[PDB]
Amino acid sequence: GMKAILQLILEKRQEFEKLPCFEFVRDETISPEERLILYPCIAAFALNFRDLNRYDYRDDNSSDYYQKIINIHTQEDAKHWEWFLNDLELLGFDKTMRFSEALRFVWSDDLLHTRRLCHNIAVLSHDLEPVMKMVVIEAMETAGLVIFHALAKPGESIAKATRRKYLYVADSHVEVETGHALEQTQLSSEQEEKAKEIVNKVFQWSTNLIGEFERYVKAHRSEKAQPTA
Amino acid sequence: AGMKAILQLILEKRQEFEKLPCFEFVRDETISPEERLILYPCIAAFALNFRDLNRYDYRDDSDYYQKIINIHTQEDAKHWEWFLNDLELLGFDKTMRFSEALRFVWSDDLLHTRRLCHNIAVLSHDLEPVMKMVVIEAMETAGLVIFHALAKPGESIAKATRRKYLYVADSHVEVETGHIITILEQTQLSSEQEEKAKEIVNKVFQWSTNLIGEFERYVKAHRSEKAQPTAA
Numbered sequence A: 001g002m003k004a005i006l007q008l009i010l011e012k013r014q015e016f017e018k019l020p021c022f023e024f025v026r027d028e029t030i031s032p033e034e035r036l037i038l039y040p041c042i043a044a045f046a047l048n049f050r051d052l053n054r055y056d057y058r059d060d061n062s063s064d065y066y067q068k069i070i071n072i073h074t075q076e077d078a079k080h081w082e083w084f085l086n087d088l089e090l091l092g093f094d095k096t097m098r099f100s101e102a103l104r105f106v107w108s109d110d111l112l113h114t115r116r117l118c119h120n121i122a123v124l125s126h127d128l129e130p131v132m133k134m135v136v137i138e139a140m141e142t143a144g145l146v147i148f149h150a151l152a153k154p155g156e157s158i159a160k161a162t163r164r165k166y167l168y169v170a171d172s173h174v175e176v177e178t179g180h181a182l183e184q185t186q187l188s189s190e191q192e193e194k195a196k197e198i199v200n201k202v203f204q205w206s207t208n209l210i211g212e213f214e215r216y217v218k219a220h221r222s223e224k225a226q227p228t229a
Numbered sequence B: 001a002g003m004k005a006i007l008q009l010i011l012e013k014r015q016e017f018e019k020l021p022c023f024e025f026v027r028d029e030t031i032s033p034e035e036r037l038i039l040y041p042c043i044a045a046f047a048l049n050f051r052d053l054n055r056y057d058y059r060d061d062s063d064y065y066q067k068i069i070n071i072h073t074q075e076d077a078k079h080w081e082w083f084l085n086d087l088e089l090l091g092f093d094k095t096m097r098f099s100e101a102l103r104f105v106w107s108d109d110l111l112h113t114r115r116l117c118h119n120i121a122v123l124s125h126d127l128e129p130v131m132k133m134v135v136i137e138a139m140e141t142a143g144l145v146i147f148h149a150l151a152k153p154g155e156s157i158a159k160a161t162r163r164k165y166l167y168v169a170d171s172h173v174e175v176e177t178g179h180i181i182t183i184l185e186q187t188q189l190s191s192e193q194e195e196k197a198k199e200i201v202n203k204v205f206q207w208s209t210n211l212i213g214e215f216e217r218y219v220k221a222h223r224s225e226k227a228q229p230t231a232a
């Protein structure tokens, strides 16, 4: 029911768009430096997402038409972790700390959902046939696009004011993810119900992650980005 | 015959695993223990993931076999703090940029170390509690071998500096000796469960073998970065 599945992704996307967090990130009455205090939280996700694309999504030896399309997709997505580290530096969040402080931060109970999003997608897709992996990926990329559409607003305000090139919370990342977020497909009967479960899970896990970002902003509300012009 | 054969394949695997070159180096009392513990920070890529594997993947907060796993997982989910304890004592809790910390953990040279717990979680997500216990037994058997070896340079530094190490330490090995086969031994299983437990034991030992391979490669790459413990 590829029309239904996509219709569900569209419906889920329309709910995801309205989470409080994105209301806050899109609010031009608040300094862009404060709207980006969630940024160091993505550390629990960005490099795990690199690994999901490199080691879980990708099966380089496949003749499957859907798998080949996934493979090209994974090539692009697996480079964005360096963009994350680029803007971590620009935003003043790449602070000197003890090795153990870094580990305790990434493995915080407060970042459980952020850290385990890629893990859950790994467990969810490890036995799926290529066409079903594409539903997983399309759901996940739709949620990614919503988040980066939001983050790119305070990101580009800082970039222009400081005259620096941002790569991660920036229109150029939204541009690549736009192409990523085919339709000539008819799913077996129980596949359609499988795909509905995929879409519900990816969006539920994505919601839980934004949940933690909101909580972290609350709890670390003075810890605003410190970019330099 | 089934479970008799399975616990026997684990002993075969343990005796094979014990002979890897990394363990010859770690046990070698002619090398300074500070040099043998060059590989210690590599465990950063595994130790907090293993905590999460115990808290979230193995553990399930009425089947009698899950109930025993949960008391098992409860205890293992505490050893990550011991890791951070010894990280400091060895002089490996150094000040660095947050990004240097992230690039360390996600290094391509710590891939197998980093994905061991990932692989175990994926293998065991859809197993009956009996087969989870197989996974846990194989994995704990690999652990005891590693910590028997590391506790040697470990206890040498602890005595020479007079400090309580908790991770590369007999006190860790002793708790882990406790870790049960005695309920596993009093279990029967199918031609299916037979073939599956065989698949499990092989993968847990191959993945642990790959992790040890990366430790050996690290030591050779970073031969100058030996531990710098402080005496009391």
Ligand SMILES: N[C@@H](Cc1c[nH]c2ccc(Br)cc12)C(=O)O
Pocket (backbone or CB within 6 Å): A042, A045, A046, A049, A077, A080, A081, A140, A141, A143, A144, A145, A147, A148, A177, A206, A209
């Ligand atoms: N465009 C993202 C990938 C992404 C895809 N889906 C996501 C969901 C939540 C978060 Br945070 C990130 C993503 C990246 O480049 O790391």
Ligand SMILES: N[C@@H](Cc1c[nH]c2ccc(Br)cc12)C(=O)O
Pocket (backbone or CB within 6 Å): B043, B046, B047, B050, B076, B079, B080, B139, B140, B142, B143, B144, B146, B147, B176, B208, B211
């Ligand atoms: N006793 C270990 C658990 C462990 C169990 N199996 C392991 C295999 C490789 C390594 Br490194 C560690 C383990 C711990 O406390 O982290």
Ligand SMILES: [Fe+2]
Pocket (backbone or CB within 6 Å): A077, A080, A144, A173, A177
């Ligand atoms: Fe991206």
Ligand SMILES: [Fe+2]
Pocket (backbone or CB within 6 Å): A076, A077, A141, A176, A177, A180
């Ligand atoms: Fe993408």
Ligand SMILES: [Fe+2]
Pocket (backbone or CB within 6 Å): B076, B079, B172, B176
């Ligand atoms: Fe342990």
Ligand SMILES: [Fe+2]
Pocket (backbone or CB within 6 Å): B076, B140, B175, B176, B179
């Ligand atoms: Fe244990």
Ligand code: NI
Pocket (backbone or CB within 6 Å): A126, A127, B125, B126
């Ligand atoms: Ni499965």
